[PDB]
């Protein structure tokens, strides 16, 4: 699945427009990417968090009901 | 940051009710989990890719462009 995809398939199921999708979810990434750039932490319930660790890199640490539902 | 922080801080940047932030984030999140339980890839350019690995757990790698903001 890529971008574009996933911009669909959101919109069919929360039955609204792409383009307020494709707003919504690129204001997501740039808020998460903003905040990894500070060195903050961006933790999710019920899906994971995203942190910066050393040099620096992007890290994604799933959460307790993701690690399940894949395993 | 934590989710409902995201949600509020989004919601500002898009102009948009915090209730259809937090529907969309969350079918964003759900579309994502049930993508990688179906043990798809979810590519998303110029942030990053979702997807199972070997048992199996899920796992982020970022991209260039935020390889790169964070260092």
Redesign the interface.
Known sequence: ???KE?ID??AK??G?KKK??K???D???????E???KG?????????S?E?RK??????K?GKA??E???
């Open positions: 699945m890529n971008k996933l398939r959101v199921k929360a609204a307020d999708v707003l919504i979810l204001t997501i990434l740039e808020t998460i990417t905040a990894l750039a903050e932490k961006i933790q999710i319930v019920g899906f994971g995203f910066v040099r620096k890199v992007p890290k994604f799933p993701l690690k539902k894949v395993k």
